[PDB]
Amino acid sequence: TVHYLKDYQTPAYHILKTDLHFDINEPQTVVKSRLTVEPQRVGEPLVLDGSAKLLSVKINGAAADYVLEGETLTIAGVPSERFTVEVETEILPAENKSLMGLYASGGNLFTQCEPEGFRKITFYIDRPDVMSKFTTTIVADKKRYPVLLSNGNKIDGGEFSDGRHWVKWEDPFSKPSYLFALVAGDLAVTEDYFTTMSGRNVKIEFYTTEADKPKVGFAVESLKNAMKWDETRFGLEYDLDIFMVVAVGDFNMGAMENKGLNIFNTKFVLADSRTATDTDFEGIESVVGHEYFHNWTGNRVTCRDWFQLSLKEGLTVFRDQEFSGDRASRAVRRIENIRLLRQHQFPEDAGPTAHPVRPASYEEMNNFYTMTVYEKGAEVVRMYHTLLGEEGFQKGMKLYFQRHDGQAVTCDDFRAAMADANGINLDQFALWYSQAGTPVLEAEGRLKNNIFELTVKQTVPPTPDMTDKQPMMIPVKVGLLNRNGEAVAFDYQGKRATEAVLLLTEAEQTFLLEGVTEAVVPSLLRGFSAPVHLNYPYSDDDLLLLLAHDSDAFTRWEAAQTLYRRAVAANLATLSDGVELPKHEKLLAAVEKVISDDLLDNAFKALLLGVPSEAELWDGAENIDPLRYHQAREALLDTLAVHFLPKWHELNRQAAKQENQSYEYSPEAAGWRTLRNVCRAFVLRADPAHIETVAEKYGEMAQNMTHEWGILSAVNGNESDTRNRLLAQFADKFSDDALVMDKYFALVGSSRRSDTLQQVRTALQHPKFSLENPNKARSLIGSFSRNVPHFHAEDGSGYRFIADKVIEIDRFNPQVAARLVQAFNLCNKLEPHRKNLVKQALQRIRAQEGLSKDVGEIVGKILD
Numbered sequence: 001t002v003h004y005l006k007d008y009q010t011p012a013y014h015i016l017k018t019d020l021h022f023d024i025n026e027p028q029t030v031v032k033s034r035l036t037v038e039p040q041r042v043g044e045p046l047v048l049d050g051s052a053k054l055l056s057v058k059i060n061g062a063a064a065d066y067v068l069e070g071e072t073l074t075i076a077g078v079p080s081e082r083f084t085v086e087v088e089t090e091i092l093p094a095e096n097k098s099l100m101g102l103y104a105s106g107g108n109l110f111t112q113c114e115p116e117g118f119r120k121i122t123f124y125i126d127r128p129d130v131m132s133k134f135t136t137t138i139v140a141d142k143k144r145y146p147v148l149l150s151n152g153n154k155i156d157g158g159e160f161s162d163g164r165h166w167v168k169w170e171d172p173f174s175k176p177s178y179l180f181a182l183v184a185g186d187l188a189v190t191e192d193y194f195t196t197m198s199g200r201n202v203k204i205e206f207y208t209t210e211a212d213k214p215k216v217g218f219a220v221e222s223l224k225n226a227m228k229w230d231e232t233r234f235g236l237e238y239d240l241d242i243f244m245v246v247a248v249g250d251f252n253m254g255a256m257e258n259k260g261l262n263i264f265n266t267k268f269v270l271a272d273s274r275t276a277t278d279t280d281f282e283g284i285e286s287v288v289g290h291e292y293f294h295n296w297t298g299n300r301v302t303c304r305d306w307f308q309l310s311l312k313e314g315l316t317v318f319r320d321q322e323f324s325g326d327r328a329s330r331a332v333r334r335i336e337n338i339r340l341l342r343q344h345q346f347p348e349d350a351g352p353t354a355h356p357v358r359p360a361s362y363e364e365m366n367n368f369y370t371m372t373v374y375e376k377g378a379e380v381v382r383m384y385h386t387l388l389g390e391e392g393f394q395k396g397m398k399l400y401f402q403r404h405d406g407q408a409v410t411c412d413d414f415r416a417a418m419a420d421a422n423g424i425n426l427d428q429f430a431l432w433y434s435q436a437g438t439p440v441l442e443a444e445g446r447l448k449n450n451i452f453e454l455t456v457k458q459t460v461p462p463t464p465d466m467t468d469k470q471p472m473m474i475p476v477k478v479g480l481l482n483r484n485g486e487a488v489a490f491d492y493q494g495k496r497a498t499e500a501v502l503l504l505t506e507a508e509q510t511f512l513l514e515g516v517t518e519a520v521v522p523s524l525l526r527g528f529s530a531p532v533h534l535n536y537p538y539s540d541d542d543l544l545l546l547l548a549h550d551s552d553a554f555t556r557w558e559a560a561q562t563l564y565r566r567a568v569a570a571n572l573a574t575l576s577d578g579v580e581l582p583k584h585e586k587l588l589a590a591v592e593k594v595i596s597d598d599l600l601d602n603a604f605k606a607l608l609l610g611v612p613s614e615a616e617l618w619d620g621a622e623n624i625d626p627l628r629y630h631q632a633r634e635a636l637l638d639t640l641a642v643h644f645l646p647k648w649h650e651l652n653r654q655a656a657k658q659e660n661q662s663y664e665y666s667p668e669a670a671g672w673r674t675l676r677n678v679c680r681a682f683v684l685r686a687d688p689a690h691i692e693t694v695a696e697k698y699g700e701m702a703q704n705m706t707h708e709w710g711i712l713s714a715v716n717g718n719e720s721d722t723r724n725r726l727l728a729q730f731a732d733k734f735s736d737d738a739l740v741m742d743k744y745f746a747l748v749g750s751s752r753r754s755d756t757l758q759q760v761r762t763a764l765q766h767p768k769f770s771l772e773n774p775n776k777a778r779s780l781i782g783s784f785s786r787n788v789p790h791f792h793a794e795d796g797s798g799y800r801f802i803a804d805k806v807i808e809i810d811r812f813n814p815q816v817a818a819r820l821v822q823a824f825n826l827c828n829k830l831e832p833h834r835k836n837l838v839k840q841a842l843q844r845i846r847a848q849e850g851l852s853k854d855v856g857e858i859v860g861k862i863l864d
């Protein structure tokens with residue numbers, strides 16, 4: 001069963017009203033539905049998706065003639081006019097380890113419906129172009145379930161003499177079923193409010209455990225900031241007088257935008273400085289923003305079909321990036337976003353699971369909540385912004401909502417809103433939705449007479465879904481530096497300026513930058529203006545000039561990245577030839593300048609001292625030995641560590657001083673700590689024995705989690721027993737904080753020590769570990785699967801381990817297992833010995849009777 005976009009057809013039925021009734025007992029919950037059904041194609045069978053235990057079905061109040069087959073219920077005898085259907089199902093939420101539909105967590109009940117979880121609750125037309133008005137009644141024992149929530153407005157409630165109580169929630173906004181939510185439990189509430197720009201108070205309520213309530217404050221402030229920002233930046237106002245957020249410790253993903261009732265992984269809502277890093281705080285801000293921004297880009301306007309997922313996710317990711325960027329540190333955060341795309345999305349586009357931003361087919365939709373749909377999706381939205389400007393982009397946004405408020409629509413409709421609102425043709429732009437793979441740009445430059453002549457070619461490789469790739473519309477933002485690193489002006493399309501966006505639309509084009517009276521070096525793809533690989537012949541000296549003087553953060557950072565990549569390549573050569581390592585003279589000169597530069601933003605400086613990951617380094621290679629790339633990258637880090645050791649200590653000292661004991665989260669304090677932690681990593685690489693000095697003063701330095709995590713990270717690969725002691729003391733200290741225990745398990749799984757696999761196997765039996773908790777499984781096993789020297793061990797032990805855990809986890813949580821199995825995506829690019837072992841691992845997974853569609857789809861893409 002493959003699903004194809006080309007086969008889309010409007011539904012035979014609409015559902016105008018969805019009246020639900022939840023009767024929560026022990027152990028079962030009984031759900032009653034009443035659907036008000038409107039025929040679209042009169043006389044067709046009514047087909048309802050569903051997998052819950054079915055107790056009864058009525059049509060117009062009478063027992064229905066129907067047939068149950070697989071996960072579908074079909075009623076052939078349908079009235080020709082408006083009618084009702086009533087379905088009664090039974091659920092055992094404590095047995096639901098998939099964490100989709102209605103499930104138990106921490107003695108409480110939660111839902112996760114996106115994409116296709118609602119059908120695990122009742123029988124429904126569970127597809128997002130079917131939008132209905134929901135009213136939800138919930139009945140439960142009061143002392144056990146004092147908090148009973150669903151979407152919208154609480155319009156009634158009461159008590160019974162047997163100790164049960166009930167509530168009724170009316171959500172007046174038509175919605176697809178994936179936006180339904182319910183929570184029932186004993187939770188503590190944190191209350192606040194926001195007043196909208198039209199003067200309406202919005203009650204804000206965050207629900208958490210009693211013990212967790214003191215950590216929810218930053219999330220609350222972030223929501224209020226996100227509400228204000230959507231008004232000032234996008235002109236978007238909230239549309240209910242209540243906004244609820246619920247934290248849950250067992251959750252497959254990060255968070256969920258259910259209308260008026262967001263549900264969040266604890267990880268993206270709970271923090272204090274004692275237990276959360278600065279990066280965790282930034283994450284809460286981003287994801288609280290994200291889910292709130294969905295209220296318009298996702299909820300008010302939703303998705304016609306799941307192939308259009310990027311319509312809401314690319315756009316909402318763009319929105320959360322712009323929110324965070326407007327809050328603080330825009331340039332640094334932009335680089336962080338680019339770095340994540342290239343480290344994680346580029347390998348997806350190069351690999352067996354590559355897909356377009358708008359896929360043309362899928363087997364299991366849960367497999368398509370991807371780096372491509374999200375992060376490349378956001379880069380595609382951002383290119384509208386680059387082409388149109390902020391004002392034009394907002395014209396498009398405005399027309400999009402005018403046209404499509406209350407509708408379930410497509411990527412094509414967003415593009416058309418952008419095109420029409422600005423009176424321009426964006427037909428070619430559509431290929432960013434339909435063509436997979438990373439475009440590669442080859443560029444060359446010459447100054448002939450007084451014209452700088454920039455020639456650019458584009459190619460887009462075949463991907464498993466599609467061989468033909470046509471030229472795309474690719475904005476390339478550029479500038480020129482003279483020998484003094486000064487900006488040079490040029491003429492383009494009758495305008496004298498220091499910067500231009502060159503729009504590449506053909507397979508090959510030459511751009512004429514006229515009126516250039518001195519030798520120049522071009523600055524290319526400024527701000528990472530398109531999601532592409534660009535090759536330009538820069539000398540090392542050219543890269544130093546860019547790094548030292550360019551006015552664009554990305555191009556400066558990319559110049560450093562390139563020097564690092566060249567240094568690693570040189571290391572690969574010498575290690576292969578069995579000779580002494582290179583000197584890296586120009587690189588060291590550059591880093592020396594970076595370290596000593598007092599004008600550089602500290603978080604930017606930290607980025608300039610970050611070396612590309614192994615995956616970046618082996619991008620484009622065949623017959624990969626991951627350990628050789630790891631060895632080469634490690635050698636470079638060893639050299640930087642030992643070579644600059646006195647400056648690492650000096651810089652560390654400055655960062656400590658300038659932090660000024662301001663241990664709470666702020667972007668300013670955080671940038672000092674970020675730099676501090678880079679220094680710590682290098683200091684402990686150069687001098688492993690320094691760990692005992694660190695351990696003696698650990699209490700003194702452990703002033704927040706950013707420091708404890710920074711320290712434990714720096715020592716994590718240390719072969720001293722003290723590494724093991726410090727980690728054990730960390731687990732003891734924070735044993736009662738599940739999000740901190742996640743950090744412990746990540747350190748266990750990610751260690752470059754020789755004994756990591758046996759330590760990981762011991763950690764599986766830790767009293768605070770649970771394989772059935774996705775945060776825990778991800779932290780320990782996910783980290784191990786990304787641990788290059790251990791996952792890719794020559795003896796195949798890493799492959800056998802991860803395949804064992806994919807097999808085990810798939811039995812109860814196919815989503816976690818299918819994410820994990822993608823650790824094998826590099827299969828066909830490996831050298832023959834590891835490739836053989838990875839194939840054996842995948843065939844063994846494939847051999848499992850009852851293997852999920854989730855994992856099966858991925859294994860097929862790799863093997864077949």
Ligand SMILES: N[C@@H](CCc1cccnc1)P(=O)(O)C[C@@H](Cc1ccccc1)C(=O)O
Pocket residue numbers: 114115253254255256257286287290291294313317320366369374
């Ligand atoms: N609609 C949610 C995903 C639901 C989902 C997810 C996975 C599988 N099935 C369903 P989200 O996109 O708002 C949250 C993102 C986190 C995020 C937030 C901000 C920026 C990027 C990603 C996530 O939880 O994945």
Ligand SMILES: [Zn+2]
Pocket residue numbers: 290294312313316
């Ligand atoms: Zn989202």
